[PDB]
Amino acid sequence: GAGEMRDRIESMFLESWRDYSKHGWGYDVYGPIEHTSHNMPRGNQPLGWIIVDSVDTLMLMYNSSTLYKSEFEAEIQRSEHWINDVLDFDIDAEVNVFETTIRMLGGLLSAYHLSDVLEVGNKTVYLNKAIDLGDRLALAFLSTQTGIPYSSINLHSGQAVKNHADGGASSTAEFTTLQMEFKYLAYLTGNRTYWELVERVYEPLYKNNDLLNTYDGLVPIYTFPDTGKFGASTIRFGSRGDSFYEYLLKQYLLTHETLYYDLYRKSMEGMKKHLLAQSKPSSLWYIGEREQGLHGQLSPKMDHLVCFMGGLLASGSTEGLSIHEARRRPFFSKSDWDLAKGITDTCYQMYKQSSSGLAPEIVVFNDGNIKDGWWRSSVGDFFVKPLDRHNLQRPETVESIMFMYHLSHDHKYREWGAEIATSFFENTCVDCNDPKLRRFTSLSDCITLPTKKSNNMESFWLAETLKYLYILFLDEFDLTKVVFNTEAHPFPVLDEEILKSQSLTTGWSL
Ligand SMILES: [Ca+2]
């Protein structure tokens, strides 16, 4: 039953949360096995990495819990007071602009939103925190002439610093996955600067590289900030590439700016033409990589991160509408929808065909040219390299499953989600037979049985994985009124007329 699954997911969240609160409260990094923790900044000041990333999940569960509503409420209060009284972003330390924007700025914005629409807590606490952090992060856009930011920035001084490696090139997805956050902040503050700075990165990216014509909208993962030109690098929908595509569509869903939908469409058709393929022997659809330009060979290697594509494609085709209604709209893309189901199925198979029921960090699909020390899936559709056997509690597959269920209403997706939730429960638990001490942790190896545990709980286990599994089992969730940032922090769809009155419009074109 949905309500029961709800109780179980809330239970898992609380088991992880109670343990974290008891042993690593206020710390950025936490290891459940040994109950150890530390902060990321050299000076040891906290960034709120886990707390801020988890607040909105607490609010969502508080809103529908029937067994622990009171506990969730108290924890929201605990988190809010800490964010208001302890957390301080005036830190003399360099932080990754992308991660801090999607997790911290995004989490504060979604906490504000949910605090607002759910009337729980004090939304002002989160908004004020978001404005201050947003200002510290925004200084990154002043470093280059192109407007493309360097990878890191000092939260106290505002000094920017290039990527230590890759010849100093920035990761393409890292500066193209900041738009939802800064645009929503612009909307809440009426401050156009946030919007202008974040939209600026696209023109040099598209124009200086002849992106549409030469690359069919597919981006190499590295781009030099000073020139805006791509560096010799792999073209993949995995890490450093993935969210560039995500935010093209999501900006359109959030602000109604059609230019981004058009760009998204171009990239999607390019993806279908150069990266799409099917595995043997189940003919599972998968997106491959091109390490040597579009004219090079196609690699069947696929990061689990690519699995977010199921939900993205479904979202872009339906615009949040249940297919019943979407199928009759002019904007509905039959191709995107069929592929969304296909990719979600493939990603589910990465769990179903896994010895532990959990998909590893990276897999290599069987393209008929898999000819050593690799592990073969149950059906043989993919292999797992010895070095990619870990599982970091990633959400991308349950993410897509959630979208597919709410848009299609096909109960099969809830069955898939339940199986995966069960696999996480049984294969990542520590002190599995004691509800009072049970916790969940990452795996150094999810292929060997019993699985081998790693002493680390990712903030996204709480911010994303458990959140999406939870939403999957909510009977009511209108995907036309919300747009999730890349760390699963929900922002409301913005009113076009209000954006216009605030002079928040597309400041460039192509
Ligand atoms: Ca994401």
mmCIF file of all heavy atoms in Angstrom, residues 410-444:
data_model
loop_
_atom_site.group_PDB
_atom_site.id
_atom_site.type_symbol
_atom_site.label_atom_id
_atom_site.label_comp_id
_atom_site.label_asym_id
_atom_site.label_seq_id
_atom_site.Cartn_x
_atom_site.Cartn_y
_atom_site.Cartn_z
ATOM 1 N N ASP A 410 1.336 4.445 -14.377
ATOM 2 C CA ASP A 410 1.548 3.014 -14.583
ATOM 3 C C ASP A 410 2.101 2.486 -13.259
ATOM 4 O O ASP A 410 3.222 2.823 -12.876
ATOM 5 C CB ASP A 410 2.575 2.788 -15.693
ATOM 6 C CG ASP A 410 2.731 1.327 -16.065
ATOM 7 O OD1 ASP A 410 2.492 0.450 -15.206
ATOM 8 O OD2 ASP A 410 3.111 1.052 -17.223
ATOM 9 N N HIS A 411 1.321 1.665 -12.563
ATOM 10 C CA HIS A 411 1.744 1.133 -11.269
ATOM 11 C C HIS A 411 3.061 0.363 -11.304
ATOM 12 O O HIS A 411 3.692 0.152 -10.267
ATOM 13 C CB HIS A 411 0.641 0.249 -10.676
ATOM 14 C CG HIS A 411 0.874 -0.118 -9.243
ATOM 15 N ND1 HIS A 411 1.670 -1.177 -8.864
ATOM 16 C CD2 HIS A 411 0.456 0.468 -8.096
ATOM 17 C CE1 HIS A 411 1.732 -1.228 -7.546
ATOM 18 N NE2 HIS A 411 1.006 -0.240 -7.055
ATOM 19 N N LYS A 412 3.476 -0.053 -12.494
ATOM 20 C CA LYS A 412 4.723 -0.789 -12.653
ATOM 21 C C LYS A 412 5.896 0.001 -12.070
ATOM 22 O O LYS A 412 6.837 -0.575 -11.517
ATOM 23 C CB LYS A 412 4.970 -1.063 -14.135
ATOM 24 C CG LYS A 412 6.355 -1.581 -14.462
ATOM 25 C CD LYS A 412 6.546 -1.714 -15.968
ATOM 26 C CE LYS A 412 6.394 -0.380 -16.682
ATOM 27 N NZ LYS A 412 6.549 -0.528 -18.156
ATOM 28 N N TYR A 413 5.830 1.323 -12.194
ATOM 29 C CA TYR A 413 6.893 2.181 -11.684
ATOM 30 C C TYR A 413 6.960 2.173 -10.164
ATOM 31 O O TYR A 413 8.043 2.275 -9.586
ATOM 32 C CB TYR A 413 6.718 3.601 -12.228
ATOM 33 C CG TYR A 413 6.900 3.649 -13.727
ATOM 34 C CD1 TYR A 413 5.881 4.111 -14.566
ATOM 35 C CD2 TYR A 413 8.076 3.178 -14.314
ATOM 36 C CE1 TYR A 413 6.033 4.096 -15.953
ATOM 37 C CE2 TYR A 413 8.239 3.159 -15.692
ATOM 38 C CZ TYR A 413 7.213 3.617 -16.508
ATOM 39 O OH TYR A 413 7.369 3.579 -17.874
ATOM 40 N N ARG A 414 5.812 2.041 -9.509
ATOM 41 C CA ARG A 414 5.809 1.986 -8.054
ATOM 42 C C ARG A 414 6.373 0.644 -7.600
ATOM 43 O O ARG A 414 7.002 0.555 -6.546
ATOM 44 C CB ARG A 414 4.398 2.192 -7.503
ATOM 45 C CG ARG A 414 4.076 3.652 -7.270
ATOM 46 C CD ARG A 414 2.761 3.851 -6.546
ATOM 47 N NE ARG A 414 2.626 5.232 -6.098
ATOM 48 C CZ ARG A 414 1.544 5.732 -5.511
ATOM 49 N NH1 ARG A 414 0.483 4.960 -5.296
ATOM 50 N NH2 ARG A 414 1.521 7.003 -5.142
ATOM 51 N N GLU A 415 6.157 -0.395 -8.400
ATOM 52 C CA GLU A 415 6.677 -1.720 -8.080
ATOM 53 C C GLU A 415 8.197 -1.678 -8.172
ATOM 54 O O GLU A 415 8.899 -2.206 -7.307
ATOM 55 C CB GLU A 415 6.139 -2.758 -9.064
ATOM 56 C CG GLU A 415 4.653 -3.028 -8.935
ATOM 57 C CD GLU A 415 4.119 -3.843 -10.093
ATOM 58 O OE1 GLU A 415 4.716 -4.894 -10.408
ATOM 59 O OE2 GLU A 415 3.100 -3.434 -10.690
ATOM 60 N N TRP A 416 8.694 -1.051 -9.233
ATOM 61 C CA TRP A 416 10.133 -0.917 -9.453
ATOM 62 C C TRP A 416 10.748 -0.117 -8.309
ATOM 63 O O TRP A 416 11.790 -0.487 -7.762
ATOM 64 C CB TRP A 416 10.401 -0.190 -10.776
ATOM 65 C CG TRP A 416 10.038 -0.965 -12.014
ATOM 66 C CD1 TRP A 416 9.440 -2.193 -12.077
ATOM 67 C CD2 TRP A 416 10.273 -0.563 -13.369
ATOM 68 N NE1 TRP A 416 9.292 -2.583 -13.389
ATOM 69 C CE2 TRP A 416 9.796 -1.601 -14.203
ATOM 70 C CE3 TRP A 416 10.842 0.573 -13.962
ATOM 71 C CZ2 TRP A 416 9.873 -1.537 -15.601
ATOM 72 C CZ3 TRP A 416 10.919 0.638 -15.352
ATOM 73 C CH2 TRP A 416 10.437 -0.414 -16.155
ATOM 74 N N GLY A 417 10.096 0.988 -7.959
ATOM 75 C CA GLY A 417 10.587 1.830 -6.883
ATOM 76 C C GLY A 417 10.622 1.115 -5.547
ATOM 77 O O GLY A 417 11.534 1.328 -4.743
ATOM 78 N N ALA A 418 9.626 0.267 -5.302
ATOM 79 C CA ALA A 418 9.549 -0.478 -4.050
ATOM 80 C C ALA A 418 10.695 -1.475 -3.959
ATOM 81 O O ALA A 418 11.308 -1.635 -2.901
ATOM 82 C CB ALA A 418 8.213 -1.203 -3.954
ATOM 83 N N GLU A 419 10.975 -2.145 -5.072
ATOM 84 C CA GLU A 419 12.057 -3.122 -5.128
ATOM 85 C C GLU A 419 13.384 -2.443 -4.832
ATOM 86 O O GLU A 419 14.195 -2.954 -4.063
ATOM 87 C CB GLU A 419 12.126 -3.769 -6.510
ATOM 88 C CG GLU A 419 10.941 -4.646 -6.855
ATOM 89 C CD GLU A 419 11.067 -5.260 -8.233
ATOM 90 O OE1 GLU A 419 12.091 -5.000 -8.903
ATOM 91 O OE2 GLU A 419 10.146 -6.002 -8.643
ATOM 92 N N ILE A 420 13.606 -1.293 -5.458
ATOM 93 C CA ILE A 420 14.846 -0.553 -5.246
ATOM 94 C C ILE A 420 14.935 -0.070 -3.799
ATOM 95 O O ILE A 420 15.997 -0.138 -3.181
ATOM 96 C CB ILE A 420 14.946 0.638 -6.228
ATOM 97 C CG1 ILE A 420 15.124 0.099 -7.653
ATOM 98 C CG2 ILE A 420 16.113 1.550 -5.840
ATOM 99 C CD1 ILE A 420 15.112 1.159 -8.741
ATOM 100 N N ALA A 421 13.824 0.408 -3.247
ATOM 101 C CA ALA A 421 13.821 0.865 -1.863
ATOM 102 C C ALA A 421 14.200 -0.307 -0.959
ATOM 103 O O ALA A 421 14.958 -0.147 0.001
ATOM 104 C CB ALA A 421 12.447 1.402 -1.484
ATOM 105 N N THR A 422 13.676 -1.488 -1.276
ATOM 106 C CA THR A 422 13.976 -2.680 -0.489
ATOM 107 C C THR A 422 15.453 -3.040 -0.604
ATOM 108 O O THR A 422 16.085 -3.403 0.387
ATOM 109 C CB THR A 422 13.128 -3.881 -0.951
ATOM 110 O OG1 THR A 422 11.747 -3.609 -0.688
ATOM 111 C CG2 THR A 422 13.531 -5.148 -0.203
ATOM 112 N N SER A 423 16.004 -2.938 -1.810
ATOM 113 C CA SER A 423 17.412 -3.258 -2.012
ATOM 114 C C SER A 423 18.304 -2.292 -1.236
ATOM 115 O O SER A 423 19.330 -2.698 -0.689
ATOM 116 C CB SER A 423 17.761 -3.233 -3.501
ATOM 117 O OG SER A 423 17.123 -4.305 -4.180
ATOM 118 N N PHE A 424 17.927 -1.016 -1.187
ATOM 119 C CA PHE A 424 18.722 -0.050 -0.429
ATOM 120 C C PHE A 424 18.646 -0.404 1.052
ATOM 121 O O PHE A 424 19.653 -0.388 1.764
ATOM 122 C CB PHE A 424 18.202 1.379 -0.626
ATOM 123 C CG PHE A 424 18.841 2.107 -1.773
ATOM 124 C CD1 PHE A 424 18.071 2.577 -2.832
ATOM 125 C CD2 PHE A 424 20.216 2.328 -1.794
ATOM 126 C CE1 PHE A 424 18.666 3.257 -3.900
ATOM 127 C CE2 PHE A 424 20.819 3.007 -2.854
ATOM 128 C CZ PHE A 424 20.043 3.472 -3.911
ATOM 129 N N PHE A 425 17.441 -0.736 1.505
ATOM 130 C CA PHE A 425 17.215 -1.089 2.899
ATOM 131 C C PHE A 425 18.051 -2.288 3.339
ATOM 132 O O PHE A 425 18.761 -2.228 4.339
ATOM 133 C CB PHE A 425 15.732 -1.399 3.131
ATOM 134 C CG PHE A 425 15.398 -1.713 4.562
ATOM 135 C CD1 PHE A 425 15.283 -0.695 5.501
ATOM 136 C CD2 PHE A 425 15.227 -3.032 4.976
ATOM 137 C CE1 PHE A 425 15.003 -0.981 6.836
ATOM 138 C CE2 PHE A 425 14.948 -3.333 6.312
ATOM 139 C CZ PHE A 425 14.837 -2.303 7.242
ATOM 140 N N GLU A 426 17.973 -3.371 2.576
ATOM 141 C CA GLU A 426 18.693 -4.596 2.901
ATOM 142 C C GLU A 426 20.188 -4.608 2.589
ATOM 143 O O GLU A 426 20.959 -5.277 3.284
ATOM 144 C CB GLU A 426 18.030 -5.781 2.190
ATOM 145 C CG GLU A 426 16.588 -6.012 2.601
ATOM 146 C CD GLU A 426 15.921 -7.121 1.808
ATOM 147 O OE1 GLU A 426 16.561 -7.661 0.882
ATOM 148 O OE2 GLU A 426 14.752 -7.449 2.108
ATOM 149 N N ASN A 427 20.610 -3.871 1.566
ATOM 150 C CA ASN A 427 22.018 -3.890 1.195
ATOM 151 C C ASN A 427 22.896 -2.693 1.546
ATOM 152 O O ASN A 427 24.087 -2.698 1.237
ATOM 153 C CB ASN A 427 22.150 -4.230 -0.292
ATOM 154 C CG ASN A 427 21.834 -5.692 -0.577
ATOM 155 O OD1 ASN A 427 22.407 -6.586 0.042
ATOM 156 N ND2 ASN A 427 20.921 -5.939 -1.509
ATOM 157 N N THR A 428 22.330 -1.665 2.169
ATOM 158 C CA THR A 428 23.161 -0.533 2.588
ATOM 159 C C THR A 428 22.988 -0.301 4.085
ATOM 160 O O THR A 428 23.593 0.602 4.656
ATOM 161 C CB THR A 428 22.841 0.802 1.837
ATOM 162 O OG1 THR A 428 21.539 1.275 2.203
ATOM 163 C CG2 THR A 428 22.926 0.607 0.330
ATOM 164 N N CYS A 429 22.171 -1.130 4.730
ATOM 165 C CA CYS A 429 21.948 -0.973 6.159
ATOM 166 C C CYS A 429 23.104 -1.483 7.015
ATOM 167 O O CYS A 429 23.851 -2.372 6.614
ATOM 168 C CB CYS A 429 20.646 -1.669 6.589
ATOM 169 S SG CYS A 429 20.490 -3.432 6.164
ATOM 170 N N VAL A 430 23.248 -0.873 8.187
ATOM 171 C CA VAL A 430 24.259 -1.243 9.174
ATOM 172 C C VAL A 430 23.398 -1.505 10.407
ATOM 173 O O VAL A 430 22.462 -0.749 10.669
ATOM 174 C CB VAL A 430 25.241 -0.079 9.458
ATOM 175 C CG1 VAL A 430 26.312 -0.529 10.439
ATOM 176 C CG2 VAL A 430 25.875 0.395 8.162
ATOM 177 N N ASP A 431 23.701 -2.562 11.162
ATOM 178 C CA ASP A 431 22.888 -2.910 12.330
ATOM 179 C C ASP A 431 21.466 -3.053 11.807
ATOM 180 O O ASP A 431 20.515 -2.486 12.345
ATOM 181 C CB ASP A 431 22.960 -1.818 13.401
ATOM 182 C CG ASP A 431 24.206 -1.930 14.259
ATOM 183 O OD1 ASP A 431 24.403 -3.004 14.869
ATOM 184 O OD2 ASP A 431 24.985 -0.955 14.329
ATOM 185 N N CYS A 432 21.360 -3.828 10.735
ATOM 186 C CA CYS A 432 20.114 -4.083 10.027
ATOM 187 C C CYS A 432 18.977 -4.652 10.859
ATOM 188 O O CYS A 432 17.808 -4.443 10.537
ATOM 189 C CB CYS A 432 20.391 -5.031 8.862
ATOM 190 S SG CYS A 432 21.841 -4.590 7.873
ATOM 191 N N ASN A 433 19.315 -5.370 11.924
ATOM 192 C CA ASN A 433 18.301 -5.997 12.763
ATOM 193 C C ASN A 433 17.951 -5.248 14.043
ATOM 194 O O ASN A 433 17.325 -5.815 14.940
ATOM 195 C CB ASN A 433 18.741 -7.421 13.104
ATOM 196 C CG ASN A 433 18.979 -8.264 11.867
ATOM 197 O OD1 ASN A 433 18.053 -8.539 11.102
ATOM 198 N ND2 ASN A 433 20.226 -8.670 11.658
ATOM 199 N N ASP A 434 18.340 -3.981 14.126
ATOM 200 C CA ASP A 434 18.050 -3.173 15.305
ATOM 201 C C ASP A 434 17.571 -1.785 14.889
ATOM 202 O O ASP A 434 18.379 -0.885 14.657
ATOM 203 C CB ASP A 434 19.299 -3.037 16.175
ATOM 204 C CG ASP A 434 18.998 -2.433 17.530
ATOM 205 O OD1 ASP A 434 18.057 -1.621 17.627
ATOM 206 O OD2 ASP A 434 19.709 -2.762 18.500
ATOM 207 N N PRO A 435 16.246 -1.589 14.810
ATOM 208 C CA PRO A 435 15.653 -0.308 14.417
ATOM 209 C C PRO A 435 16.144 0.912 15.192
ATOM 210 O O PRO A 435 16.057 2.038 14.701
ATOM 211 C CB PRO A 435 14.153 -0.552 14.600
ATOM 212 C CG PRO A 435 14.106 -1.592 15.681
ATOM 213 C CD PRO A 435 15.205 -2.530 15.256
ATOM 214 N N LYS A 436 16.664 0.691 16.394
ATOM 215 C CA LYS A 436 17.150 1.794 17.213
ATOM 216 C C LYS A 436 18.583 2.210 16.888
ATOM 217 O O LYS A 436 19.020 3.290 17.281
ATOM 218 C CB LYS A 436 17.032 1.437 18.698
ATOM 219 C CG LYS A 436 15.593 1.270 19.166
ATOM 220 C CD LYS A 436 15.515 0.995 20.657
ATOM 221 C CE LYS A 436 14.067 0.885 21.117
ATOM 222 N NZ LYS A 436 13.962 0.645 22.583
ATOM 223 N N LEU A 437 19.308 1.360 16.165
ATOM 224 C CA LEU A 437 20.692 1.656 15.793
ATOM 225 C C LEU A 437 20.927 1.556 14.286
ATOM 226 O O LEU A 437 22.007 1.874 13.795
ATOM 227 C CB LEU A 437 21.649 0.697 16.503
ATOM 228 C CG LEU A 437 21.731 0.764 18.030
ATOM 229 C CD1 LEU A 437 22.651 -0.339 18.531
ATOM 230 C CD2 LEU A 437 22.245 2.126 18.464
ATOM 231 N N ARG A 438 19.917 1.111 13.555
ATOM 232 C CA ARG A 438 20.039 0.953 12.113
ATOM 233 C C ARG A 438 20.333 2.269 11.388
ATOM 234 O O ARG A 438 19.771 3.311 11.721
ATOM 235 C CB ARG A 438 18.752 0.318 11.574
ATOM 236 C CG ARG A 438 18.784 -0.074 10.106
ATOM 237 C CD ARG A 438 17.653 -1.050 9.816
ATOM 238 N NE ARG A 438 16.371 -0.514 10.261
ATOM 239 C CZ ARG A 438 15.335 -1.259 10.630
ATOM 240 N NH1 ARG A 438 15.423 -2.582 10.611
ATOM 241 N NH2 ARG A 438 14.210 -0.679 11.022
ATOM 242 N N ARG A 439 21.236 2.205 10.411
ATOM 243 C CA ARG A 439 21.615 3.362 9.591
ATOM 244 C C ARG A 439 21.826 2.855 8.174
ATOM 245 O O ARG A 439 21.820 1.650 7.931
ATOM 246 C CB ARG A 439 22.940 4.000 10.042
ATOM 247 C CG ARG A 439 22.976 4.587 11.424
ATOM 248 C CD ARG A 439 23.552 3.595 12.401
ATOM 249 N NE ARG A 439 24.992 3.377 12.258
ATOM 250 C CZ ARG A 439 25.608 2.290 12.712
ATOM 251 N NH1 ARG A 439 24.897 1.334 13.290
ATOM 252 N NH2 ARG A 439 26.918 2.139 12.574
ATOM 253 N N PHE A 440 22.044 3.783 7.248
ATOM 254 C CA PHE A 440 22.274 3.433 5.855
ATOM 255 C C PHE A 440 23.513 4.161 5.366
ATOM 256 O O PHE A 440 23.698 5.346 5.641
ATOM 257 C CB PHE A 440 21.037 3.775 5.029
ATOM 258 C CG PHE A 440 19.799 3.096 5.533
ATOM 259 C CD1 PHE A 440 18.973 3.724 6.459
ATOM 260 C CD2 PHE A 440 19.524 1.779 5.173
ATOM 261 C CE1 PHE A 440 17.894 3.051 7.029
ATOM 262 C CE2 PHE A 440 18.447 1.095 5.736
ATOM 263 C CZ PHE A 440 17.634 1.732 6.667
ATOM 264 N N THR A 441 24.362 3.443 4.641
ATOM 265 C CA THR A 441 25.623 4.012 4.195
ATOM 266 C C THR A 441 25.997 3.640 2.759
ATOM 267 O O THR A 441 25.394 2.748 2.158
ATOM 268 C CB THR A 441 26.728 3.539 5.173
ATOM 269 O OG1 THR A 441 27.913 4.317 4.997
ATOM 270 C CG2 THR A 441 27.034 2.061 4.941
ATOM 271 N N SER A 442 26.991 4.334 2.207
ATOM 272 C CA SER A 442 27.451 4.055 0.853
ATOM 273 C C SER A 442 28.153 2.704 0.823
ATOM 274 O O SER A 442 28.467 2.128 1.870
ATOM 275 C CB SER A 442 28.414 5.142 0.367
ATOM 276 O OG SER A 442 27.735 6.362 0.118
ATOM 277 N N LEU A 443 28.393 2.210 -0.384
ATOM 278 C CA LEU A 443 29.035 0.918 -0.582
ATOM 279 C C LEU A 443 30.304 1.032 -1.413
ATOM 280 O O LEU A 443 30.320 1.702 -2.448
ATOM 281 C CB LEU A 443 28.069 -0.036 -1.296
ATOM 282 C CG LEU A 443 27.119 -0.954 -0.520
ATOM 283 C CD1 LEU A 443 26.764 -0.370 0.823
ATOM 284 C CD2 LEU A 443 25.885 -1.203 -1.371
ATOM 285 N N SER A 444 31.368 0.381 -0.958
ATOM 286 C CA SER A 444 32.612 0.378 -1.714
ATOM 287 C C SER A 444 32.438 -0.676 -2.811
ATOM 288 O O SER A 444 33.115 -0.640 -3.839
ATOM 289 C CB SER A 444 33.796 0.015 -0.812
ATOM 290 O OG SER A 444 33.649 -1.287 -0.270
#
